[PDB]
Amino acid sequence: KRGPLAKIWLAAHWDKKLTKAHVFECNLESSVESIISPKVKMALRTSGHLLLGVVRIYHRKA
Amino acid sequence: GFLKLIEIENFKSYKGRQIIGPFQRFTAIIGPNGSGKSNLMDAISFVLGEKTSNLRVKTLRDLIHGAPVGKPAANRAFVSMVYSEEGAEDRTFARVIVGGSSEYKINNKVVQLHEYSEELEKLGILIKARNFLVFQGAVESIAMKNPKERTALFEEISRSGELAQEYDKRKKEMVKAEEDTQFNYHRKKNIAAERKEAKQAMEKLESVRDKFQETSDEFEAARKRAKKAKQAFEQIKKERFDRFNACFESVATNIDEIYKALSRNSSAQAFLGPENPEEPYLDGINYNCVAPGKRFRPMDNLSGGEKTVAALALLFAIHSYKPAPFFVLDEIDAALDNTNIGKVANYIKEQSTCNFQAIVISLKEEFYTKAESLIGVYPEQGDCVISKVLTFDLTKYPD
Amino acid sequence: ILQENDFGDFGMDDREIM
Amino acid sequence: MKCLSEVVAVDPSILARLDMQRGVHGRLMDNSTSVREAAVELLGRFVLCRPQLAEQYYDMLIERILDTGISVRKRVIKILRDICIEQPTFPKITEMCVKMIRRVNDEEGIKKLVNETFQKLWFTPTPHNDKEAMTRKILNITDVVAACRDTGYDWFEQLLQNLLKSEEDSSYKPVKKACTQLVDNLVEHILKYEENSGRLVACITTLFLFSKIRPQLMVKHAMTMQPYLTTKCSTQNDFMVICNVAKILELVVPLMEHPSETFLATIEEDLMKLIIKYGMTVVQHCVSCLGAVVNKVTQNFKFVWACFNRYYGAISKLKSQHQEDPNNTSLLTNKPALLRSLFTVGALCRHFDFDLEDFKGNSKVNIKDKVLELLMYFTKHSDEEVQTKAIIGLGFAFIQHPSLMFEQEVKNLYNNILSDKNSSVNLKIQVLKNLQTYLQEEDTRMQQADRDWKKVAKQEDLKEMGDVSSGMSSSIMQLYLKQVLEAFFHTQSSVRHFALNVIALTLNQGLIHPVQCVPYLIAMGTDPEPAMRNKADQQLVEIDKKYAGFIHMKAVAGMKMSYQVQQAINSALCSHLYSMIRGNRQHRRAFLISLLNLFDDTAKTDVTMLLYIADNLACFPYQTQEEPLFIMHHIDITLSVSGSNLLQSFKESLIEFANVSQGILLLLMLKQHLKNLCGFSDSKIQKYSPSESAKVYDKAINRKTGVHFHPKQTLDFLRSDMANSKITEEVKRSIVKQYLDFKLLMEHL
Amino acid sequence: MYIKQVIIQGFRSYRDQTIVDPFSSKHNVIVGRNGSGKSNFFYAIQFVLSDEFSHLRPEQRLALLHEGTGPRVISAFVEIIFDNSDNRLPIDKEEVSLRRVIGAKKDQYFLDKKMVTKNDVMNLLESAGFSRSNPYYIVKQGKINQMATAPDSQRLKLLREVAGTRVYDERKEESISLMKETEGKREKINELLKY
Amino acid sequence: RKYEAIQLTFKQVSKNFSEVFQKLVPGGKATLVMKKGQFTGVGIRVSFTGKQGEMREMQQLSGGQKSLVALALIFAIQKCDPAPFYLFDEIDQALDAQHRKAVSDMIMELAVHAQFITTTFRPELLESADKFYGVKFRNKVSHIDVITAEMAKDFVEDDTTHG
Ligand SMILES: Nc1ncnc2c1ncn2[C@@H]1O[C@H](COP(=O)(O)OP(=O)(O)O)[C@@H](O)[C@H]1O
Ligand SMILES: Nc1ncnc2c1ncn2[C@@H]1O[C@H](COP(=O)(O)OP(=O)(O)O)[C@@H](O)[C@H]1O
Numbered sequence A: 001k002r003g004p005l006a007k008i009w010l011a012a013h014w015d016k017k018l019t020k021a022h023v024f025e026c027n028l029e030s031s032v033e034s035i036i037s038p039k040v041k042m043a044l045r046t047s048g049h050l051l052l053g054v055v056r057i058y059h060r061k062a
Numbered sequence B: 001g002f003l004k005l006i007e008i009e010n011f012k013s014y015k016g017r018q019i020i021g022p023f024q025r026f027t028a029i030i031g032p033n034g035s036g037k038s039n040l041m042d043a044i045s046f047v048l049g050e051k052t053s054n055l056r057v058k059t060l061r062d063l064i065h066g067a068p069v070g071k072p073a074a075n076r077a078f079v080s081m082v083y084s085e086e087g088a089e090d091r092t093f094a095r096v097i098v099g100g101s102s103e104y105k106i107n108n109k110v111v112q113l114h115e116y117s118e119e120l121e122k123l124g125i126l127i128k129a130r131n132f133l134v135f136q137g138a139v140e141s142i143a144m145k146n147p148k149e150r151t152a153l154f155e156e157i158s159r160s161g162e163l164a165q166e167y168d169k170r171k172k173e174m175v176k177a178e179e180d181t182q183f184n185y186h187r188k189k190n191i192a193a194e195r196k197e198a199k200q201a202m203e204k205l206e207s208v209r210d211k212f213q214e215t216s217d218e219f220e221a222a223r224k225r226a227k228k229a230k231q232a233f234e235q236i237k238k239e240r241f242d243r244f245n246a247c248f249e250s251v252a253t254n255i256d257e258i259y260k261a262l263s264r265n266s267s268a269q270a271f272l273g274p275e276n277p278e279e280p281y282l283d284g285i286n287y288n289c290v291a292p293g294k295r296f297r298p299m300d301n302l303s304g305g306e307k308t309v310a311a312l313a314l315l316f317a318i319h320s321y322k323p324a325p326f327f328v329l330d331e332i333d334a335a336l337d338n339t340n341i342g343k344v345a346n347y348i349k350e351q352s353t354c355n356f357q358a359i360v361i362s363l364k365e366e367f368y369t370k371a372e373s374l375i376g377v378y379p380e381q382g383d384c385v386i387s388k389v390l391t392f393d394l395t396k397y398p399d
Numbered sequence C: 001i002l003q004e005n006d007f008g009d010f011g012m013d014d015r016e017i018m
Numbered sequence D: 001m002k003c004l005s006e007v008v009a010v011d012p013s014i015l016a017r018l019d020m021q022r023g024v025h026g027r028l029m030d031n032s033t034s035v036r037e038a039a040v041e042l043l044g045r046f047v048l049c050r051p052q053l054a055e056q057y058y059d060m061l062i063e064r065i066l067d068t069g070i071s072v073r074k075r076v077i078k079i080l081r082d083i084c085i086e087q088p089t090f091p092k093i094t095e096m097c098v099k100m101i102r103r104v105n106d107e108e109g110i111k112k113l114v115n116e117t118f119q120k121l122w123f124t125p126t127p128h129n130d131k132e133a134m135t136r137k138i139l140n141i142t143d144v145v146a147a148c149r150d151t152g153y154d155w156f157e158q159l160l161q162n163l164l165k166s167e168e169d170s171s172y173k174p175v176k177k178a179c180t181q182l183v184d185n186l187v188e189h190i191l192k193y194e195e196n197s198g199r200l201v202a203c204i205t206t207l208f209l210f211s212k213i214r215p216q217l218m219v220k221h222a223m224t225m226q227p228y229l230t231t232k233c234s235t236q237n238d239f240m241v242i243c244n245v246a247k248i249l250e251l252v253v254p255l256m257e258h259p260s261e262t263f264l265a266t267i268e269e270d271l272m273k274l275i276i277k278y279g280m281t282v283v284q285h286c287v288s289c290l291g292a293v294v295n296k297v298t299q300n301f302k303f304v305w306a307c308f309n310r311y312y313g314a315i316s317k318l319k320s321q322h323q324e325d326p327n328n329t330s331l332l333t334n335k336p337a338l339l340r341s342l343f344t345v346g347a348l349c350r351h352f353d354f355d356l357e358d359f360k361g362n363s364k365v366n367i368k369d370k371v372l373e374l375l376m377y378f379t380k381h382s383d384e385e386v387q388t389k390a391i392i393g394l395g396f397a398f399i400q401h402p403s404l405m406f407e408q409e410v411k412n413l414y415n416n417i418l419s420d421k422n423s424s425v426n427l428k429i430q431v432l433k434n435l436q437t438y439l440q441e442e443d444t445r446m447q448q449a450d451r452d453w454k455k456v457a458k459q460e461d462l463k464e465m466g467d468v469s470s471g472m473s474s475s476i477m478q479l480y481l482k483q484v485l486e487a488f489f490h491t492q493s494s495v496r497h498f499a500l501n502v503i504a505l506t507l508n509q510g511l512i513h514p515v516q517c518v519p520y521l522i523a524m525g526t527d528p529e530p531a532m533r534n535k536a537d538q539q540l541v542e543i544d545k546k547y548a549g550f551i552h553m554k555a556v557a558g559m560k561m562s563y564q565v566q567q568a569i570n571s572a573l574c575s576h577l578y579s580m581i582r583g584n585r586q587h588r589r590a591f592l593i594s595l596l597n598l599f600d601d602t603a604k605t606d607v608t609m610l611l612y613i614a615d616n617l618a619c620f621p622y623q624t625q626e627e628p629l630f631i632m633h634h635i636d637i638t639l640s641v642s643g644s645n646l647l648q649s650f651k652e653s654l655i656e657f658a659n660v661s662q663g664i665l666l667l668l669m670l671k672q673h674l675k676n677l678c679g680f681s682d683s684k685i686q687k688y689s690p691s692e693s694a695k696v697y698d699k700a701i702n703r704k705t706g707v708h709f710h711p712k713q714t715l716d717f718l719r720s721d722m723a724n725s726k727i728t729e730e731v732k733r734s735i736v737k738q739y740l741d742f743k744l745l746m747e748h749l
Numbered sequence E: 001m002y003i004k005q006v007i008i009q010g011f012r013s014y015r016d017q018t019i020v021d022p023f024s025s026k027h028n029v030i031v032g033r034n035g036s037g038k039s040n041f042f043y044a045i046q047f048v049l050s051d052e053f054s055h056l057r058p059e060q061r062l063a064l065l066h067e068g069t070g071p072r073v074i075s076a077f078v079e080i081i082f083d084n085s086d087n088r089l090p091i092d093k094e095e096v097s098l099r100r101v102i103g104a105k106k107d108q109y110f111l112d113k114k115m116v117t118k119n120d121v122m123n124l125l126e127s128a129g130f131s132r133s134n135p136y137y138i139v140k141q142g143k144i145n146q147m148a149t150a151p152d153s154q155r156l157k158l159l160r161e162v163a164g165t166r167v168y169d170e171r172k173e174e175s176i177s178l179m180k181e182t183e184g185k186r187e188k189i190n191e192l193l194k195y
Numbered sequence F: 001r002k003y004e005a006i007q008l009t010f011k012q013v014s015k016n017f018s019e020v021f022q023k024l025v026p027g028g029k030a031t032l033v034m035k036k037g038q039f040t041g042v043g044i045r046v047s048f049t050g051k052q053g054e055m056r057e058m059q060q061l062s063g064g065q066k067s068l069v070a071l072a073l074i075f076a077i078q079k080c081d082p083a084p085f086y087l088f089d090e091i092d093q094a095l096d097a098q099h100r101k102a103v104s105d106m107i108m109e110l111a112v113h114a115q116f117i118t119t120t121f122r123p124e125l126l127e128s129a130d131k132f133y134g135v136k137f138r139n140k141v142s143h144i145d146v147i148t149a150e151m152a153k154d155f156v157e158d159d160t161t162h163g
C-alpha cells in the first residue's frame, strides 16, 4: 500500500500482485535485512512475516 | 445371592487388615476428591482379575500400599471378598500377591487361575466382558465406541469367542476347496479344448484323453473333499449363527422395552443396527437412539445426559439377558440435573430390590438420599494417606 | 455415431418433486 | 465444439447436414458437462440468430435445463431468458416459464441469477404509462400461476420470499412499490373482469399467493371483492373462488387497521349461509376464516356456540332415534343432513376448542368427551359413507387435541379399519388423509409460533422444556406405524400415494427412526407412477447424503418387498439402488456375494423372485470392467459345484429336481447374456480372480444394441415350468430334453 | 477483550438470534437444563474464529444447518460484534464485526461488509493472539480433563505456542527445502559458468 | 532470540504455576522440572498432604486432582500473559464444593485480567459472576436472553422436582 516495506507486506501476505520489475531491482536484500535487524517495537509474528517476504524475494531472484 | 463384604491388605492406602462393612442391597461410597474411593472398585476388579492399565497403574508392583510414592508397605498383599447366598452359605474368595506374582484362593487354599475362572463363571462373572464395572470418563465413551470392540463384547458374551479359530479355519478350507475345484475346472476345460483341436496323431490323442480322464478323477476327488468340508462348515455356521442371533434378538427386545420404560415417556426410541445382518457377528454393530425431546441427530452431537441414558440402558439390558450378581457404578450422575438423577435413583430403588445388588459412588446428595446404607471414608495424613471406613444406616428415617 | 454417452438417460434422470 | 459453434453462429445456413446433426445430438447426450454446455450454447446461438425452425428442437432444449452440472444450467438459463426477452407470443412460453422456477432453490448461484433475471423481466417499477405492456405482463403472470396448479405452488412463493429478503434496507423498494402497482391492477382487472371463469380463478390464485407471501397490501380492496363472496352459481370453479377468497380474508382481516364491526358481522352471517347451502370442502375452507375472525378480535362467539348447540341437539335426536331403531327410515331422509352435522361438529372442534370456561360459560360438562364418544358410536354403523363421515369428523376433531388419539379405542378404530384386508378401500384413503393433514397443521403451527417467540417469551418457564407437547406427535407413530407397513401391501395405488406422502412428511419432520421403512421405500421406488418412485428415490438419497451404510443394511429385504409389490401390481426396476451404491467396492461386493450365494445355493425359494433378480442383474447399468468379471468368477465357482452335483445326481437317478434345474438354467442364461453383452473373451474370464488389483479392470464397458434376450428365454422356460406336476409322458420328454440342454451347457467353452 | 454481542441465523439450533443486551467485561454465567442446546454457542464461536473444525467432511457441514421445520435452509450465518478498544486488533475502528456466511459448498467471511481472501482472518487473529489450533482457553462439554492427562509432547507444543514461536518452525522448514534446491541450481550455474 | 525467549517464558510459567498451585491447593507444592535439554520433555512434580513425603507421577490421580492440575496450568499461562478471552463448559465437574469456592475466588481474583464466560450446574460457582444469561429451548428451538440472579439461583439448586 505505502512504505519501503510495503512490497515485503505484499510478498508475505498477498504474493499475487508482485511482478518481475519489483523482483529484479527495487531493493537490495542485504540492505533491507540490516534495516529490519535493529528496529524497535517489532512483534514476533510480524518479524516472521518479514522473514517470509525476504526469503520469498531472495528465492525469486535465484 | 450377592457380595457380603470385602477385605484388603496393603493395597492402595489400606494399611493392615480392615473389615469393610457388610453390603446391603443398595449402598454407596461417598467422599471428597482424592479420598481414596475408586481403589475399592480397583480391588473389586483385581480379585476378579483384569489387566493393570485400566487400574491407572502399571507393572502391578506399584499396587502395594506406599508404592506410588516409592516406599512400599511390604512385599505382601491380600485382597479377599465374601459372597453371601441363600441357603445359609457363603463363599470366601481371595487373591494373594507377593511382588510381581499372584495366585488365587477359595476357602483359603491355593487355587490355580483356570479352575478359578470357570467356577466364577458358574457364579456368573465374565471377566472378559468388562461391561459392568464403570470408569471415570468412560460412560460417554460407551455410546461413542468404535463398533468393533462392542461387537467383540457381544460376540464373547454369546460364548462363541473361543470358536473364532475353528470357524475361520473351516472358512479358509472353504475358500481353498472352492479355488481348487474351479482350478481343476479351468484346467480340464483347457485340456478338452486342446484335445478338440487335437482331433482335427492318434497316439498323442489317446494319451491326452487319458490325461483328461486323470484330471476328471482329480476334480472328482476335490469334489468329495469340498463336499465333506461343506456340511461341517454348515453346522459350524448354524451353531454360531443360532447362539449369536438369539442373543441379539433378546438384547434388542429387552433394550427396547427397558428404554421406553426408563425415560418415563412414550416418545423415545432406541435401536442397535447390525452391519451385514445376514451374518453380522463378524461385522460391526452401531447403536442409535432417539432423544426424549430432541430431533434425530447423529450420536456424536449429543450432550452428556442422553449418552448416560443410552449407556445405562445397554448395561441394564445386558444384565437382563445375562445377570451379574452385583453392580459397581462410577459417578453415572455426571452432568445431570435433579430430574434425571431422581429417575435413575427411583429406577434402581424399584429394580434392585428383587433383581440385583448395586453399589455406587457419587457426590450429588439426592442420588444416595434414596440409599438404604452408606459407607463413609475419612482420609488421614501421615507419611502417606491412610483411609478409614465407617458405616451409616439410612432405613430408619421418614419420607 | 454415438460413441461416448450414457445408457439412455438412466444415469441422468434426477426428477422434479412437489 | 465451441469453435464450430462460433462457425455455425457466423453461418446458420449449414445446420442441415446429417452427420454433424448426429454429432451435436451425441454431444448433447455425451457423458460430460463441458461438451453439453458447448452443444447447448450452439443451439441457443442458432435460436437467437434464427428464431424460426428451432421450435422443433425446443423440446430437447427445454429438457437440457436439468443437467446436474454447474455452468450448463447457467448457460441454458441465459438462452431461455434471451428467448423470452426477444420474442413474445411464442406458443410455449408460459409452460417454459414454469420449469426454471422449479430450479430456483437448487443452488445459491442459480437462485441469484434467476432472481434478478425475472426481476428485470417482470418486477420493474413501470411508471404511469404503457398500460398494454403491464396488461400482457399481468396476462403472462396469470397464465404462469394457472399452469402452476397441477404440480405445486411452493416454488413461486419461495421465489417471492427470495425477492423479499433480497432488499433488507430501503433501496427505494423497487419491487415493493411495483408489487402494490401489480396487485390493485389485478383488482382493476377484476374490476374490469365483471363476467372465462378459469381466468377469474387464476387471478384469485395470484391474489392468494400474494396473500401467502405477505398480507400487507389487500387491506383496502377487501370491500371491493366483498360482493363477489356473497352468492354465486353451483359451478366448481366458483366454489374454489369461494374457498380462496375465504383464505384471503382470513389473512388480511387481522392486519387491516380499525375495521367496521358490522362489516365483519355481515361477512360472518353470509358465510354461515354459504355453509348451510353448499358442499363440505367450501365449508371447511370457510369455517377456517370464521374461526379466525371470531377468535381474533370480536366477541360474538355465543351465536356460533348456539349454532353448535343446534347441531348437537340434532345429532342427539338422530342418535336417540338410532338407540332403539337401528333400521329406522327417518335417518335415511336426513342422512345428508346428518353428514353435514358431522362435518360441522368436526370443524367446530377443529378450529378452536369450545370446551372452555367462556364458550360453555357454566359448570364443566366436558362436551369434548361426549362428542368423541358419540362419534365413536356413529362410527359403528351399517352403511359405509356414514363411517367415512365419522372418520372425517375424527380427524378434524383430533386436529385441535392430539392427546385424544392416546386413547385405546381410537387405536382400535384405526388398526381394525386398516388391517383385516378390509373390503372398503376409501376408509384407508380418508384416514391417511387425516394423518397427512394432521402433520401439515402441526408443522405449520410450530413454524409460525417459532416466528412470534418474543410475544410469548416471558410468560413461560425454564426448568420444564415443555416437550410432550411435541413428544406426543412423535409418540403416536410408535402405536401404529408398523400397522402402516402392511398398509403398503395394497393393490390400489391411491393407498400407496397417501402412505408414501405420510411417511415422507414424517421423516421430513423426522420424529421417527430413519432406517426402519427403507426396504418398503426401496420397493415402491419400483412403482409405475413417476411421482411415487420420484419421492421414494428422493427420500433415499436424502438419507444417503446424511447416513452412509443405512441402505447397505437393508439390501435383500428391499428385494423381497419389491417382489411383494409386483405381486400387488398383479430395464432394472431397482437400478437406482445400484446407482447410489456404485461407489464402495467392499459393500457392493458383499451385497452381490450375499445375493448370489444365499438365494442360489440351498434356499428353496420361489423361482420367480430369482427370475426378477436375474432380470435386474442383467439390467443394472454397470460402468467399469471389474464388476461383471467378479460376477462371472463367483458364478463359475458356484455353477461348477452345483451343476456337477445336480448332473451327477440325475445321472444317478422329481419335481424338486425340475425346480432346482430351472434355477440352475436361470443362472446359465444370466451368465450367457452377461457374457454376450460385455463382449469379452472367455479366456480372460478364465484368467480372472477376485481382488487381483483395483486399478487393472476399470475400463469403460461398451453396451451393444438389442442384446436383451434373457427375459424372453427365461419366460419361455418358466412357462415350460409353471411349477407343474403331472404324470404325462410329455413332461418326461421335457425333462430329458432339458437334461440334454444341460449336457450341452456343461460342454460349452 | 470484550465481546459485545452475537447474532445467529440457521447455524445448528437457532432460527433467528435477535439483538439482546450485551455482555460484561468481567464474567458471564449461563445455566440451563440438560440438553439445553448450549454447545451451539461453543461450536458457533469456534467456527467463527478457529479453522480446524472446518476441516472434516462436507456431510456434517450440510448437517451444520438448523433443520427444525418449515423450509430447509441452505444459507446460514453467524455474526460476532465486539470493540477493539485497546487497539490490540490492528484495524483502526471501534465496533468491529466478524461474520461467517455458510452454504452447502459456500463459505464467506465479512469484516464490516468486506470480502476476505481467507488469509486476512488467519494473520488477523494471529496478531490478536488467537490460535486456530489450540485446545487452550476453550473447553468442550465434558472434555476438560484430557489436557491434564495429555502427555508431554503437546505440552511442549503448548508452551511453544505461548511463546508465540509456533509460526517459526513451519516457516524455517519451508525455507530449508527451497534453500537446498537453490543450492543445486547455483551449483549447476557454476559448472555451466565454467562451460 | 527465540531460544532465550523460550527459557524466560518457561521460568515465568513454572513460577506462575507453582504460585497458583499454592493458591488453589491450601497445602502442598507443585512445579515444573525441565528435562535434559535439545529439549525433549518437561515434567510435572506435585507433593501434597505431607508436602515432602508424598512424591507422585502423572497418571495415578483423582479426577479433581487432575482438574486442579489443568486449571492451574490454565492460569499459569493466563497470569504469564492473558489470552483475550476465556470460556468454560462445566469446568467444576469432578471437583468438590470447597474447591468450587476456591476456583470462584480466583475468578474474582482474575476478573480484571480477562473476560471469563462459564456455564455450570452448581450454585457456589455462580456467585462469582457479574450478570446472568439464560437459555430457553421451546418449540423445538433454542434462544438466549438475559435473566436475573435470584430466579437463576432458584433453578440451579433450589427447585428439585420432576421438571
Ligand atoms: N498405594 C497408595 N498409597 C498411598 N496413596 C496412594 C496409593 N495409590 C494411590 N494413592 C493416591 O491416593 C489418592 C486418592 O486417589 P485414589 O486412591 O486413586 O482414589 P479416588 O480416585 O477415589 O480418590 C491419589 O492421589 C492417589 O495417587
Ligand atoms: N441440525 C439441526 N437442526 C435442528 N435442530 C438441531 C440440529 N442439531 C441439533 N439440533 C437440536 O439442538 C439441540 C442440541 O442439544 P444437545 O446437543 O443435547 O445440547 P448441548 O448443545 O448443550 O450439548 C437438540 O435439542 C437438537 O434437537
Ligand code: BEF
Residues within 6 Å of the ligand: B303, B304, E032, E033, E034, E035, E036, E037, E038, E039, E141
Ligand atoms: F444444554 Be447443554 F447439555 F450444554
Ligand code: BEF
Residues within 6 Å of the ligand: B031, B032, B033, B034, B035, B036, B037, B038, F061, F062, F063, F064, F065
Ligand atoms: F478421584 Be476420586 F476421589 F473418585
